[PDB]
From a paper:
Here, we report the crystal structure of the C-terminal hydrophilic domain of nsp4 (nsp4C) from MHV strain [name], together with the structure of a [name] site-directed mutant. The structure covers an 89 amino acid region from T408 to Q496 and is shown to possess a new fold. In particular, the C-terminal hydrophilic region from T408 to Q496 is highly conserved among all the coronaviruses, indicating that nsp4C may play a similar and conserved role in coronavirus replication.
Mutagenesis of Cys425 to Ser broke the disulfide bond, but two mutant monomers interact with each other via their cross-linked C-termini to form a strikingly different “close” conformation compared to the “open” conformation of the wild-type dimer, in which the C-termini of the wild-type monomers are oppositely oriented. Thus, the mutant [name] monomer structure contains four α-helices (α1–α4) and four β-strands (β1–β4). The conformation of the four α-helices and β-strands β1–β2 are identical to WT, while a short β-strand (β3, S449–M452) between α3 and α4 and a long β-strand β4 (β4, T487-S493) at the C-terminal are formed for stability of the dimer during the crystal packing. Two monomers of the mutant [name] also form a dimer in the asymmetric unit, with their N-termini in parallel and in the same orientation. The C-terminal β4 strands of the two monomers are cross-linked and form anti-parallel β-sheets together with β3 at the bottom of the dimer. Ser425 from each monomer in the mutant dimer is oriented on the outside of the dimer, far away from intersecting C-termini of the dimer. Thus, mutating Cys425 to Ser does not directly influence the interaction between the C-termini of these two monomers. In the case of the [name] mutant, the disulfide bond is dissociated and the dimer adopts a more stable conformation by crystal packing: the flexible C-termini of two monomers are stabilized by hydrogen bond interactions between the amino acids in the Ala488-Thr492 (β4) and Ser450-Met452 (β3) loops, which form stable anti-parallel β-sheets at the bottom of the dimer, resulting in clear electron density from residues Ser489-Leu495. The intersecting C-termini of the monomers result in a “closed” conformation of the mutant dimer. Thus the conformation of mutant [name] dimer is not likely to be physiological but instead an artifact of crystallization.
Author numbering:
A (entry chain B), B (entry chain A): 0 to 88
Write the structure that this text describes.
Amino acid sequence: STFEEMALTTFMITKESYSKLKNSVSDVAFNRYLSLYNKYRYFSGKMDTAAYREAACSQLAKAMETFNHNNGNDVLYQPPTASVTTSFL
Amino acid sequence: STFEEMALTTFMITKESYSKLKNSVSDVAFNRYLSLYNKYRYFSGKMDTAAYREAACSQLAKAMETFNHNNGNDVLYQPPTASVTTSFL
């Protein structure tokens, strides 16, 4: 989907950007994402690739409410840091 | 792009998914990947997100060649098992 897809890319949250994003997600999900963010906010270490994706959406949510209560500033959105460890594929 | 998007998912390679995938990628690209299989098959450790993506592609290119060379018997493609250590912003 566009939202989760976007939460996995670096970009600027702007007027256009944010508008695009509010309209690609349901507020029930958006507010759900905004809640979990607290779950991860201060967590560092390994997690399954599926948990990373859910986590990134959370950060996108937070990054969005920040821009919205900025008065249309512009905020940089970078996916949460990822050091992936694979072994001989 | 189709090739990479799928290198990120688990699916059964069939005559139909081989082909869709092959048509999408140039021989140069496919072979490069196939060739990078020889790098990642032995990689064991931390890599960033783009590297993991190229890693998953080399793994799919390889699975396709395994498909092609076993007379088209189904071969399950599966992205390289991974754990991402994270921190947010």
